Amino acid sequence: GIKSFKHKGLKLLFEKGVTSGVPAQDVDRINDRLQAIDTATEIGELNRQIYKLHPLKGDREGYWSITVRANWRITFQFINGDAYILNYEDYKLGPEQ
Ligand SMILES: [Cl-]
Numbered sequence: 001g002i003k004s005f006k007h008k009g010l011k012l013l014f015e016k017g018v019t020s021g022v023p024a025q026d027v028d029r030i031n032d033r034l035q036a037i038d039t040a041t042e043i044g045e046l047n048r049q050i051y052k053l054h055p056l057k058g059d060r061e062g063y064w065s066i067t068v069r070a071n072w073r074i075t076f077q078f079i080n081g082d083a084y085i086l087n088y089e090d091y092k093l094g095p096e097q
């Protein structure tokens with residue numbers, strides 16, 4: 001399950017159905033990714049072609065990324081079947097990752 005958020009927009013969407021903090025057009029796909037993270041018990045369940053699952057490195061060691069659309073990505077820690085510190089970002093990852 002999802003246990004914590006860094007990004008208030010994702011938190012409000014997931015917990016309350018409030019859509020103010022994300023692009024309107026993306027609400028359904030963001031909910032799809034959140035629901036996938038929430039129901040996964042192992043990280044490989046998120047290794048779906050359209051999700052572009054990627055473990056992050058360096059200062060982001062311990063985090064994972066999945067893609068909503070374009071460069072829109074949800075990042076999180078995944079530990080003992082639960083997801084933590086969920087964040088939302090809009091940029092492509094660089095070569096050191
Ligand atoms: Cl939280």
Ligand SMILES: [Cl-]
Pocket residue numbers: 041042043044081
């Ligand atoms: Cl796992």
